[PDB]
Design a protein around this ligand. Structure first.
Ligand SMILES: [Hg+2]
Ligand SMILES: [Hg+2]
Ligand SMILES: [Hg+2]
Ligand SMILES: [Hg+2]
Length: 329
């Protein structure tokens, strides 16, 4: 895949929607070992570098507007987790014991300067937080930070599974990820003599957009960690990468439409080279200690449809704007 070409297409859409959308979103889907993480990172870096180069010769072009307007209310539609219930959750290690597997549990908010926390069935571990060369216009949102915590998985009606199948669609707080998408769509659909996309974006930043903090995944602690990625008023391009962003079940299915309805979405799905990916994933399992030999790793890859990508393909939502890309080496 030509990442510079991707960057060009992203900038083209942002420019086309400059007066209609505050930010553009990019969905990048791929099975384990497809390279979605790295592609997202490179795409992001390329865009920010181009912007920094632009600022070099347009030093004071940045302007923040809407100085006399109120902050966009992102979670007014959510019910407030009353103080008593907040304490209970915290007392219960930041979890909602009776809703860990409830995909219909609606996200709730509460005051955590003022900071608003938004949590769903995964509890505080997957909380989204909203506040009130240095300037980057692109940010990535890995789906990994929404992985349910290990302690959360211990509450599953069947603890044995969940852990054994950690990484399946049901082991992520899809409720809160969808909520992040609704928040992003709301910030995108806010009221927003040159042809330069960077010039246009530089003059249209808005003071009404709050900082949004999203969880990340700590590969060392084997659990999600708070505020690893910040999406601020300066973020005009959000690159979301993950396994289930185009999955046709439960809350995942609502992701595409939620972001597609902004009219500012680019969608990419990685088509893998089976052999190379099989080897890549087998090696990860070996390095991670999950298996004792590469052969055992290859076997797990072949027999687990969550690993070989068969599940993602079988459940790919039927839409006409998914651009399939290759990431061969
Ligand atoms: Hg995996
Ligand atoms: Hg759980
Ligand atoms: Hg808005
Ligand atoms: Hg920030």
């Amino acid at each position: 895949v030509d990442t510079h070409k991707l960057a060009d297409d992203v900038l083209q859409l942002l420019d086309n929607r400059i007066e209609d959308n505050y930010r553009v979103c990019v969905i990048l889907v791929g099975s384990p070992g497809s390279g979605k993480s790295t592609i997202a990172e490179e795409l992001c870096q390329i865009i920010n570098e181009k912007y920094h180069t632009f600022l070099s010769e347009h030093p004071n072009v940045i302007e923040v507007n809407d100085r006399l307007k109120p902050m966009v209310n992102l979670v007014d539609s959510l019910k407030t987790l009353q103080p008593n219930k907040v304490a209970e959750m915290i007392e219960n290690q930041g979890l909602f014991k009776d809703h860990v597997e409830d995909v219909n549990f609606q996200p709730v908010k509460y005051s955590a300067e003022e900071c608003t926390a938004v949590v769903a069935r995964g509890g505080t571990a997957n909380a989204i937080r909203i506040a009130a060369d240095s300037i980057n216009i692109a940010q990535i949102v890995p789906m990994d930070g929404f992985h349910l915590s290990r302690r959360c998985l211990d509450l599953f009606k069947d603890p044995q599974t969940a852990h054994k199948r950690r990484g399946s669609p049901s082991t992520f707080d899809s409720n809160n990820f969808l909520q992040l998408c609704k928040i992003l769509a709301k910030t995108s659909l806010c009221k927003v003599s040159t042809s330069s996309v960077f010039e246009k974006l530089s003059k249209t930043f808005s003071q009404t957009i709050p900082d949004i903090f999203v969880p990340g995944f700590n590969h060392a602690l084997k659990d999600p960690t708070p505020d690893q990625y910040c999406i601020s008023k300066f973020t005009r391009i959000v690159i979301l990468e993950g396994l289930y962003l185009l999955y046709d079940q439960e809350n995942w299915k609502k992701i595409y439409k939620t972001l597609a309805d902004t009219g500012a979405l680019l969608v990419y799905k990685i088509d893998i080279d089976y052999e190379a990916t099989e080897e890549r994933v087998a090696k990860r399992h070996l390095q991670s200690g999950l298996v004792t030999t590469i052969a055992e790793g290859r076997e797990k890859f072949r027999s687990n449809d969550l690993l070989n990508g068969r599940d993602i393909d079988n459940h790919l939502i039927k839409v006409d704007n998914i651009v399939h890309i290759r990431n061969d080496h």
